[PDB]
Write an enzyme that holds these catalytic residues in place. Sequence first.
Site, PDB file in Angstrom:
ATOM      1  N   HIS D  52       0.880  -1.096  -0.058  1.00 30.12           N
ATOM      2  CA  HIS D  52       0.043   0.168  -0.474  1.00 30.12           C
ATOM      3  C   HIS D  52       0.485   1.321   0.129  1.00 30.12           C
ATOM      4  O   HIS D  52       0.796   2.369  -0.658  1.00 30.12           O
ATOM      5  CB  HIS D  52      -0.788   0.403   0.944  1.00 30.12           C
ATOM      6  CG  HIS D  52      -1.826   1.270   1.372  1.00 30.12           C
ATOM      7  ND1 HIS D  52      -1.549   1.880   2.584  1.00 30.12           N
ATOM      8  CD2 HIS D  52      -2.662   1.805   0.674  1.00 30.12           C
ATOM      9  CE1 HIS D  52      -3.129   3.084   2.044  1.00 30.12           C
ATOM     10  NE2 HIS D  52      -3.171   2.704   0.609  1.00 30.12           N
ATOM     11  N   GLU D  55       1.898   1.591  -3.740  1.00 26.48           N
ATOM     12  CA  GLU D  55       1.221   2.082  -4.388  1.00 26.48           C
ATOM     13  C   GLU D  55       0.764   3.814  -4.663  1.00 26.48           C
ATOM     14  O   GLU D  55       0.443   4.497  -5.374  1.00 26.48           O
ATOM     15  CB  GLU D  55       0.052   0.946  -3.982  1.00 26.48           C
ATOM     16  CG  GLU D  55      -1.202   1.941  -5.636  1.00 26.48           C
ATOM     17  CD  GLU D  55      -2.581   2.859  -3.989  1.00 26.48           C
ATOM     18  OE1 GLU D  55      -1.875   2.790  -3.206  1.00 26.48           O
ATOM     19  OE2 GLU D  55      -3.699   2.987  -4.547  1.00 26.48           O
ATOM     20  N   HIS D  56       0.755   4.392  -2.919  1.00 28.17           N
ATOM     21  CA  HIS D  56       0.774   5.298  -2.857  1.00 28.17           C
ATOM     22  C   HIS D  56       2.164   6.461  -2.872  1.00 28.17           C
ATOM     23  O   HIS D  56       1.581   7.200  -3.320  1.00 28.17           O
ATOM     24  CB  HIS D  56       0.511   5.835  -0.650  1.00 28.17           C
ATOM     25  CG  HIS D  56      -0.746   6.100  -0.790  1.00 28.17           C
ATOM     26  ND1 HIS D  56      -1.313   6.758  -0.831  1.00 28.17           N
ATOM     27  CD2 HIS D  56      -1.779   4.675  -0.785  1.00 28.17           C
ATOM     28  CE1 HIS D  56      -2.572   7.054  -0.066  1.00 28.17           C
ATOM     29  NE2 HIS D  56      -2.809   5.453   0.214  1.00 28.17           N
ATOM     30  N   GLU D 125       4.365  10.498   2.945  1.00 29.01           N
ATOM     31  CA  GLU D 125       3.341  10.166   3.096  1.00 29.01           C
ATOM     32  C   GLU D 125       3.093   8.950   4.461  1.00 29.01           C
ATOM     33  O   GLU D 125       2.019   9.047   4.495  1.00 29.01           O
ATOM     34  CB  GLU D 125       3.477   9.330   2.074  1.00 29.01           C
ATOM     35  CG  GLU D 125       2.824   8.705   0.902  1.00 29.01           C
ATOM     36  CD  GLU D 125       2.051   9.176   0.730  1.00 29.01           C
ATOM     37  OE1 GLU D 125       2.221  10.669   0.459  1.00 29.01           O
ATOM     38  OE2 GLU D 125       0.691   8.776  -0.327  1.00 29.01           O
ATOM     39  N   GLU D 132      -5.236   7.353   7.145  1.00 28.11           N
ATOM     40  CA  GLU D 132      -6.072   6.971   6.374  1.00 28.11           C
ATOM     41  C   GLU D 132      -6.617   5.543   7.213  1.00 28.11           C
ATOM     42  O   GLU D 132      -7.234   5.273   7.138  1.00 28.11           O
ATOM     43  CB  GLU D 132      -5.339   6.594   5.108  1.00 28.11           C
ATOM     44  CG  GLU D 132      -6.121   5.287   4.182  1.00 28.11           C
ATOM     45  CD  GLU D 132      -5.334   4.862   2.486  1.00 28.11           C
ATOM     46  OE1 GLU D 132      -4.286   5.424   2.735  1.00 28.11           O
ATOM     47  OE2 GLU D 132      -6.081   4.522   2.231  1.00 28.11           O
TER      48      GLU D 132
END
Lengths: 49, 11, 122, 443, 57, 48, 48, 406, 406
Positions: D52, D55-56, D125, D132
């Site tokens: 994840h 991908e971010h 990030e 999230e």
Amino acid sequence: MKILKSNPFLALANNYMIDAPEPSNISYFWNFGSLLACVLVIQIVIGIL
Amino acid sequence: SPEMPDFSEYQ
Amino acid sequence: MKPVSLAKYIQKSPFLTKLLLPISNAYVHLSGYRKYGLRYDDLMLEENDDTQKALSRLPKMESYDRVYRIRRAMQLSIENKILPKSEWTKPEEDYHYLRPVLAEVIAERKEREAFDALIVKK
Amino acid sequence: ATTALPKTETTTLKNGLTVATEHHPYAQTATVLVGVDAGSRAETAKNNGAAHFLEHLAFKGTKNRSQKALELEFENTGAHLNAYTSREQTVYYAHAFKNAVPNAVAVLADILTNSSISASAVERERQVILREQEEVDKMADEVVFDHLHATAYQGHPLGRTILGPKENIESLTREDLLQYIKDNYRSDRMIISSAGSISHEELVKLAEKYFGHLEPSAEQLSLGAPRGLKPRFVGSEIRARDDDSPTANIAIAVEGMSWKHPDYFTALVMQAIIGNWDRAMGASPHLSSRLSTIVQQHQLANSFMSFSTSYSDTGLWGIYLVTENLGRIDDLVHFTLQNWARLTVATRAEVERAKAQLRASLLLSLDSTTAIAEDIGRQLLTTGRRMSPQEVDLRIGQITEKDVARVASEMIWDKDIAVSAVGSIEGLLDYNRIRSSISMNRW
Amino acid sequence: DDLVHFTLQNWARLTVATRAEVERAKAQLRASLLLSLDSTTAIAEDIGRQLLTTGRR
Amino acid sequence: VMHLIALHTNGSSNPLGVTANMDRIPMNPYYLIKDLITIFIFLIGINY
Amino acid sequence: VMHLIALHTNGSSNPLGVTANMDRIPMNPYYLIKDLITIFIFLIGINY
Amino acid sequence: ISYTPKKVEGVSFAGRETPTATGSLSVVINAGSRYQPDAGVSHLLEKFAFKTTEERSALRITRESELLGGQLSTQITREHIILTARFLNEYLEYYARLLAEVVDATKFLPFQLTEEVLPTARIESELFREDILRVAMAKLHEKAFHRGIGNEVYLPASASPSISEIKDFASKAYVKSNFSVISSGPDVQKASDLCAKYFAVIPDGSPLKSAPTKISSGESRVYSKGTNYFCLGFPAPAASPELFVLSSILGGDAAVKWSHGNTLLAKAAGTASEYKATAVADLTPYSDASLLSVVISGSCPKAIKATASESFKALKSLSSNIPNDVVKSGIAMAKTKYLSAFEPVTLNAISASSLVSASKGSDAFISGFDKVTPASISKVVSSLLAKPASTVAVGNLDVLPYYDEL
Amino acid sequence: ISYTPKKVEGVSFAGRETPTATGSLSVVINAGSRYQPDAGVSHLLEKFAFKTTEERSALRITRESELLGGQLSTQITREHIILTARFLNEYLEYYARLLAEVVDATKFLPFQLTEEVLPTARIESELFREDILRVAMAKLHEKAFHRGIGNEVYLPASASPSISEIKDFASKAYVKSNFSVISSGPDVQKASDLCAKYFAVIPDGSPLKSAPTKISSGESRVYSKGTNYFCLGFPAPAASPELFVLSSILGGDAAVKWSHGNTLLAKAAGTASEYKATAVADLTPYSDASLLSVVISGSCPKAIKATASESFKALKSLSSNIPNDVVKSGIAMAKTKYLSAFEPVTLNAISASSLVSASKGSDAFISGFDKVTPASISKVVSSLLAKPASTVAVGNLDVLPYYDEL
Ligand SMILES: COC1=C(OC)C(=O)C(C/C=C(/C)CC/C=C(\C)CC/C=C(\C)CC/C=C(\C)CC/C=C(\C)CC/C=C(\C)CC/C=C(/C)CC/C=C(\C)CC/C=C(\C)CCC=C(C)C)=C(C)C1=O
Ligand SMILES: CCCCCCCCCCCCCCCC(=O)OC[C@H](COP(=O)([O-])OCC[N+](C)(C)C)OC(=O)CCCCCCCCCCCCCCC
Ligand SMILES: CCCCCCCCCCCCCCCC(=O)OC[C@H](COP(=O)(O)OCCN)OC(=O)CCCCCCCCCCCCCCC
Ligand SMILES: CCCCCCCCCCCCCCCC(=O)OC[C@H](COP(=O)(O)OCCN)OC(=O)CCCCCCCCCCCCCCC
Ligand SMILES: [Zn+2]
């Protein structure tokens, strides 16, 4: 709430003998069950004696 | 939230 | 199950209807529910799902009138009396106000009674 | 003048890269997809959540172009771009006007094949990932499904969450992500697929121009082959009680069928037999499912949905119940499991109705080009080919009631279950009483 | 039925009323008989009714 | 006892044969005194 | 029977003496099998 | 790709040929909330779809459609009632017959309204009322337009129309001159013949008459404890390509998935409140009017106020002159969005407006995008700012601004 | 009959002498809904009155008041918080002590808030919401004045302030410089001495600060099936005798019991709808604003519309040339209607508004009635109709008119 509707045993008595909705136009032929119960009680007591 | 407790002893 | 009256079979032959009309009139007079002012459709049992659903599809005025009729009949039966000869239910007011609704409900229930039994003949 | 559904071509680029296109002549938009057969299962206990995070970080700059040079390369030409990851595959897809695709393909290739991850980007990030994760806990469905997955395949990499533990998020470094790129991004395990107005030859030329430099993996395997030990299904239960939730979400599942199992469409047919329901549906009283009728008449719940999630070497097959009548949960569970067990003696009309419904619904959920491209990508990723509708019709046609009875007897009849409950679950009985309802005693 | 039963029971209990309840009722009644008159219309109505029903105020 | 507990769930019928849910009276004051006459009559019958 | 009826309305106690309205389990099969062992032991004793 | 209008046997038809295995059939009846006599009549009339007809009962319509493997759906907007049914292409005649029967003969049984129809409407209204954003947008619509399309689409909690009113409205609305037929199967000629043969028994009435839309302004306020919203609203004349270009130039939604954006609204939010409040804009075309709205949402009222002021300043800045690159980007994005709003077989708020209007709804509309110039956008913006806008504020009302403070 | 203000020990006082056996004691506090920090804080703070203090529990307070024979009543309005106590003249010292103790020291127990205060406030809010006319007038106030007195008074159904907010608001609101003491017993000197003695330990805080009222206009529409309503609202600056005379000129009710009246509104209703829609006008004076409202109520929507149009025409024609006899009758009626509001002991809007402003009050305000000319009333009317009015419609919205169609 009154006692008769709160205590368990008194509630059991009330739901069957005191507060119980019944038809308002049942004739005299609906009393034979109480007579049967009385006769059965009399028989039990007399037989025990 | 934690991880899964190890149940391998009773399995 | 349920009443199996066969008046429809009899009504096919006008001979039988003409012969049996006076007997039916005498029998309806003898049954004597009109003396209490009740309609014939107040005497049918209402303790199943079909009749309980049908009673909810009646017009409000009909339901109120039925309630009044039953209450008056019970009050009359309490003291062992009947209505005078002028207040008896006339034949004009003795119509079927419950049969069509019950028939519709039974037809809907019967409709479903088929999809589950469906089989594939191949 | 009737036209026919366009077949999907397929070619390989001498490197294992398979391209599949479904040309649409009179189409104004187009969709290009790029997927990799590497989800969150390939992670270990240390570098979990790296998929994840990776991908971010894809759309934050490359060696050639930096950030704010990608958005100005996409926003200017009117080209949406999106991506998401799953437990076994990760995907990328960009859709643009008919004329803008031949540059979206190039930009996607530049993003995928070449990349640059900076420590500043990771340190930026990290907080986004933490936010999230903090937000995702609110939704009931995601929490319930994550708990069910964790409690089903406990002790196996398939039982982890895609996001990863909160401790791992604030500890990953750039080296692990670079290792993930070097390991799991290979031409043998990648795929492109388009379902728009871009010709097959043009896509082949673009792929050869912007993808003919990847290195095939050393372990030359097929597509969708299992990689690791087969996970063991372990029946268990998880109860996350919370008395302030008005509703109560419960999920019950058994072991399902893998993608290559010869009893896949039978499980789908049984799922269609059970079906789904909702109190707001217009035709709620008139449904032809026994469970729907019994639930609707007594108002035992608000809705329920039946799912058949399937993985490479295992799967899940169950129901997801949402209810608001706290006090009759045990009745709902008992009736659901009773209807589950009743499938051993299923009739012949039910099977035909479910077969027709499944045949209709299988090819009726693909309307937009994005959906068709996603379906093509998934179907090629898992099995290895995109089955023609003739093959699907033939496979569905073979199903009879006796096959349904056999599968229900060998999978559902008196077998272990894995449950997961969230909300006000005081009225939900314990495990043994729940399990006792899955096998009827009259027979 | 419970409400009616308790209301009538509190009615019937008044045959063994205690001094404190009577004193409180006396104070409340004395206050209420005077707190009502707060306007010319109310005073005129009270005077008229008292003269019409009894004969004097 | 089982007889009575099975009967009590739906109530008694009436000579008319229609539903009696519209008019009902409690058993305590009315039907506990309508049974006394029958009891005394039965007693006078059995004592003779 | 009256003993059981009176007890049923409030539940049984626990060795700790604190309330147990937080973790409750149904009687069967969890307490319908714990009694079988004692039943069989008493049967052994009386039979001997 | 675009539906081609046609008229056969006094029936409006619009077909489309696509290479798929499925199909679609819909009727777009001009009987929405705009034409309702009383409150909530349109909602109940729409909810009466696929009920007991003169030839079939609801049980048959549901169970036999399930046996055939098809989906039946219904839709209600502020100007339309849509009855649709998707199916495999092998069952076109049956679904044409079903839709024709539902439209023509749909006998209204009095005991169905009190058992199946009304509770569904109540549940739908409650679900709509729970959604805060939908309520705010409906309030903005009601404040902008007076009563034409500013009515209440869903049934209020204090209304109960009789079956007679619904029957009267159905008898006045379901006529051959008050709807159309939309089909998008793989065969068009066969579908056209089927629709012409079957949709020819409904009596030919006259289209419903409604007064032209009346445009005004107003501000509404409400209190809430959760997230706060502040929506702007600019009523506009009939939709034109310049309006779509302006809506895409304002922007608000990111192109790349995880990013901020370079549109005017995104930059305004970034330089106003460090991306603590998000601003988006979109356009909703109608039969003879349009509404361009700007929605600002967040959890910090101060940030919402600051970004609202910045966005209003940015919008006002568009009246002087626009650089060419901004116009190009807006044109590209607007064209992409407009063409992507056509792929699904379900009629949304854009395709329906194009189909109802017979003056080159889509064939010439696309060609009008490339002719947009900065002068046209400046003129449109200048004409838009003449009258004041309409605002709806949800949340803390002591910080959320009025229109005069923007 | 008139309150003569004083200031003893830095405490505002307002005495009055009456020949009665019962006194009173009210503490008017500037802590209404105009000064509240968040929604519903003022209502909850008012509800906390006469709760557990630092010297006696609420049960003790209630039992002591019951034994002594007195009535404790509170009152929450749009611009004040009033705590009253009616008693026999013997217990004046005790009741002054109780009021001083309640205002000065009153501990806030959270369980009291969660047990008694919140359910009572919720019940009062539902009781208010059940009524329709009060909601209409509240919405009229909301649309007329933007903030301050435009805030909702009662607690919203979706709000729940914490105990800390109420505690700090009470800490910064109950100070000597932010309330007054009003007594109207048979003795003023003794009451003044007792009030100065007991209302003396309260800290010398600072008066609460609020912005000057901002006036605007707007229209709101709501739906109902029962009796229809239609209201008109003209905001105006601080009240003057001209406004009172104008309101009495409009009239609306009947002087004698069973009649139609002969004022402007009654004649308008009779000529328009044959007395099928009663029209009534009234004025609500605030500290620095006033709202002259006209309420048209009835069952027939068409009669309502006709009456509204005719009434607006009459109001417009009222500015041309007012006959002297009309002004004379209006002054004669207005004098009585204004004076009659001072007889009741409990304060209302008129008496509180007069007492707040010490510049005029009631000594010279009544004297200015007899110096009103038709030119002054015409000037006031012409000034009122410059800015647009505000309307609120309840009922069938398809017939009730907007402001542009009056
Ligand atoms: C709404 O519709 C309905 C109505 O209709 C319209 C109704 O009407 C009714 C309501 C009315 C009914 C019909 C309900 C009643 C009917 C029944 C429930 C039927 C059931 C009847 C029975 C259970 C019969 C019970 C009778 C018993 C138990 C007989 C035992 C009697 C005794 C114990 C006392 C008598 C003494 C005897 C026989 C012993 C000899 C006497 C001695 C003095 C010697 C003994 C002395 C000693 C041993 C000393 C030591 C004693 C000790 C310490 C032990 C305690 C004492 C004992 C004696 C046990 C209902 C419900 C209804 O639905
Ligand atoms: C020897 C065989 C008969 C032996 C005696 C057989 C008869 C026994 C008593 C009759 C049956 C028991 C009474 C049942 C009804 C009852 O409970 O009455 C109690 C009443 C109050 O009952 P309540 O009306 O419901 O009010 C209370 C409601 N709260 C406030 C709680 C919410 O409180 C009262 O005012 C009275 C309380 C008395 C409780 C019973 C005492 C036991 C009887 C003592 C002996 C009395 C003298 C006997 C002389 C023959
Ligand atoms: C009074 C007794 C005297 C005779 C004693 C001998 C009786 C022989 C019993 C044989 C062993 C039991 C086999 C059943 C196993 C089983 O099937 O267990 C299944 C069930 C339920 O479990 P489940 O379906 O949820 O499992 C789910 C699987 N996935 O458990 C039971 O019902 C336990 C029943 C045991 C017998 C009852 C004993 C208690 C009675 C005495 C206490 C009360 C006294 C009252 C006064 C008399
Ligand atoms: C064979 C032996 C039988 C018992 C012997 C006679 C008993 C005394 C009777 C003489 C006085 C009667 C009281 C007068 C009315 C009154 O005073 O009270 C009235 C009460 C109702 O209460 P109320 O509040 O509505 O009264 C109004 C306001 N106070 O009606 C009664 O209680 C009736 C008493 C009868 C006792 C029950 C008889 C029926 C037995 C049914 C058997 C059922 C099965 C039993 C199985 C074992
Ligand atoms: Zn993410």
